[PDB]
Design a binder for this molecule. Structure first.
Ligand SMILES: NC(=O)C1=CN([C@@H]2O[C@H](COP(=O)(O)OP(=O)(O)OC[C@H]3O[C@@H](n4cnc5c(N)ncnc54)[C@H](OP(=O)(O)O)[C@@H]3O)[C@@H](O)[C@H]2O)C=CC1
Ligand SMILES: NC(=O)C1=CN([C@@H]2O[C@H](COP(=O)(O)OP(=O)(O)OC[C@H]3O[C@@H](n4cnc5c(N)ncnc54)[C@H](OP(=O)(O)O)[C@@H]3O)[C@@H](O)[C@H]2O)C=CC1
Lengths: 117, 117
């Protein structure tokens, strides 16, 4: 979240790094926009740092109903200044750092009462 | 074929054109390496000049047997200085300009007798 890490610091550091001669191409998803065979043919080496960008579901009955959303997706829409819906009462399921970030961002986003399960 | 069009002329003209500020990216097949949705998102317009790059088959019995090859593929392997096999006797089926180019390139490539059907 923004209150813990300022994005201006991150942007300034990446600008410092790209001054060194590293080219960053945004909005390019490998396998969906550009093949991996293309990168394999055109480059002397390939490194995959894709990360873990899926959210585990509730693993319960009715987990597919409307009104249930993952924590990672929620934080991504918060970051991109998109249009979200929260409501007065929000229940966050989990106990790691994702749950803490979701709960505190929800408290900042006008949720009147937030409870962690 | 090279004896009718010199490739040095074509290369010099394309160099003249690319001096004007046009970037040409080689070895990039759209739909196989780069998606068309990528170009649709990243560019203000897209023009498709892909051409007709398939050869019609013989439409006869045994057309899939080894030893039968298309004219376009044959001319492409001649151009790329690849390793081909012809033999003493070659039969070219067709009557257009593709047949003429194939027959004359075959006469230059050591075929002792070439016949056009
Ligand atoms: N990379 C990071 O920053 C770290 C991740 N986290 C937390 O862990 C998550 C992912 O890492 P990892 O620890 O491997 O993930 P886990 O699969 O271990 O899940 C982590 C959290 O969810 C609980 N949990 C998992 N499955 C269920 C289920 N069916 N029902 C109820 N609770 C469940 C765990 O509690 P329990 O203690 O009982 O296992 C814990 O609170 C993050 O989303 C975050 O919440 C926390 C610290 C470091
Ligand atoms: N772009 C170019 O440069 C032009 C193309 N060509 C010729 O035409 C071809 C492609 O253009 P297009 O004319 O539309 O192609 P076509 O499908 O009309 O075929 C052209 C040639 O093949 C003959 N042919 C077609 N199908 C069969 C079959 N089953 N059996 C035997 N002969 C057949 C035609 O003779 P028929 O006279 O009886 O139709 C003609 O010689 C080229 O490969 C080339 O050979 C020639 C001039 C211009």
């Amino acid at each position: 979240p923004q209150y813990r890490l300022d994005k201006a610091l991150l942007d300034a550091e990446v600008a410092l790094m790209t001054k060194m001669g590293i080219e960053i191409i945004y909005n390019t998803k490998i396998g969906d926009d550009v093949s991996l065979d293309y990168l394999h043919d055109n480059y002397d080496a390939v490194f995959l740092g894709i990360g873990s960008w899926q959210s585990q579901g509730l693993r319960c009955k009715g987990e597919d109903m409307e009104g249930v959303l993952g924590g990672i997706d929620f934080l991504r829409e918060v970051t991109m200044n998109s249009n979200i819906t929260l409501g007065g009462k929000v229940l966050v399921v989990g106990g790691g750092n994702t749950a803490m970030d979701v709960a505190r961002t929800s408290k900042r986003l006008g949720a009147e009462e937030v409870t962690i399960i």
